[PDB]
């Protein structure tokens, strides 16, 4: 599975490599610090949100085991040898952050939805779709990056379809946070419209590095991609929760939660 991605066909400088290894293991550390932030003001949300809060240490805990577990698969399947890292095992492929997408992914929606004070059949039925429609983006474009390095034909097909998924999941999301924005409390009526922002434009990130094998395919196009990677999560992620925490603890202190009025 890792010699039909970009990164088998290169040899990388020391400065290329070691600016990768610092990137993935720079995002642990900014994942795991993010979890202990999200545990520890969890006590300031009150039950009706606090799950918003368990999804976002869920998602850190997610994200931090794939980058690290990426990081040691970088250093694993690379040796400098004669002045340049060359690949010496085939260990190391990006197939595992789609794993990681289907899965936090959901969790990123569902702390959305929860926010959005939707409940009971509405929350079972939008989230069934959205988390489909992910899937169906996630699995199609898991089989396009198969052939990033073979069949870019095949890449830009599965990357089209992909992004019809994509398309219908986002226009779902926005179509329930438009008209379920009037229900939320302490002003995050208006915080809402910009976490949907922020999301469209943080999520976008992913298609551009998926499409730098067929626009730059190069040494420079893997480091290009992993730096996409690192900004895309941060703000999907971390950044992301981080909001959605506030709204949840907003709209708590709002609720006369006295934890959160106190904070
Ligand atoms: C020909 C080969 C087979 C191709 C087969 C794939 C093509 C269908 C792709 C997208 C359709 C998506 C439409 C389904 C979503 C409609 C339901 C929905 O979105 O409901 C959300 C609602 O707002 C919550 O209550
Ligand atoms: C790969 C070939 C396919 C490419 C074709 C792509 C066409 C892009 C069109 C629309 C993007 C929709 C973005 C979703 C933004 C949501 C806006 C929204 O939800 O509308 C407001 C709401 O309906 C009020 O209640
Ligand atoms: C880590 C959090 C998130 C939300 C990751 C999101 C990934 C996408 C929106 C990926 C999208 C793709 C599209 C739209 C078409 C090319 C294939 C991709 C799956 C990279
Ligand atoms: C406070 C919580 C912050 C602590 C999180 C950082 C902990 C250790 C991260 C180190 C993991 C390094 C992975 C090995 C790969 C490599 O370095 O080459
Ligand atoms: C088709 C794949 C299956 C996906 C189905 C998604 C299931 C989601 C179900 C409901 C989410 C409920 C969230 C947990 C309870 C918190 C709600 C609350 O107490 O306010
Ligand atoms: C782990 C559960 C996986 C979810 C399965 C149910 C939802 C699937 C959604 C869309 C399926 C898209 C079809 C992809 C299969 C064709 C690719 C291939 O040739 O193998
Ligand atoms: C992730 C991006 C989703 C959108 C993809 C856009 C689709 C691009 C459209 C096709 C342009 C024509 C393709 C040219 C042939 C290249 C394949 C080949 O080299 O054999
Ligand atoms: C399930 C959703 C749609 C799947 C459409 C599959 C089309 C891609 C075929 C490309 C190919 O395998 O040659």
Not at 115 to 136: D, R, Y
Not at 231 to 239: E, F, L, Q, R, T
Not at 244 to 250: F, G, R, V
Request: proline residues 2%; contains cysteine; hydrophobic residues 55%.
């Amino acid at each position: 599975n890792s010699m039909k991605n970009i990164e088998s066909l290169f040899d990388y400088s020391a400065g290329q490599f070691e600016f990768i290894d610092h990137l993935l293991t720079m995002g642990v550390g900014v994942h795991f610090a993010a979890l202990i932030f999200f545990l520890v003001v969890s006590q300031f949300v009150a039950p009706k949100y606090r799950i918003a809060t368990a999804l976002s240490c869920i998602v850190m805990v997610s994200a931090g085991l794939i980058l690290n577990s990426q990081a040691v698969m970088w250093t694993d399947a690379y040796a400098y040898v004669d002045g340049s890292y060359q690949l010496q095992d085939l260990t190391f492929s990006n197939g595992y952050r789609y794993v990681n997408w289907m899965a936090t992914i959901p969790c990123l929606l569902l702390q959305l939805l929860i926010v959005l004070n939707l409940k009971g059949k509405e929350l079972f039925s939008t989230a069934t779709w959205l988390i489909l429609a992910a899937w169906g983006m996630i699995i199609t474009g898991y089989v396009g990056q198969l052939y990033e390095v073979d069949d870019i034909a095949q890449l830009m097909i599965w990357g089209a379809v992909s992004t019809a998924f994509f398309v219908v999941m986002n226009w779902i999301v926005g179509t329930k946070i438009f008209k379920n924005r009037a229900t939320m409390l302490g002003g995050t009526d208006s915080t809402i419209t910009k976490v949907f922002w922020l999301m469209m434009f943080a999520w976008t990130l992913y298609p551009i590095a998926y499409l730098v094998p067929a626009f730059m395919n190069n040494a420079d196009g893997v480091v290009l991609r992993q730096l996409l990677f690192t900004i895309a999560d941060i703000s999907s992620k971390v950044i992301y929760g981080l909001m959605i925490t506030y709204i949840a603890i907003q709209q708590s202190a709002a609720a006369g939660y006295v934890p959160a009025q106190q904070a």
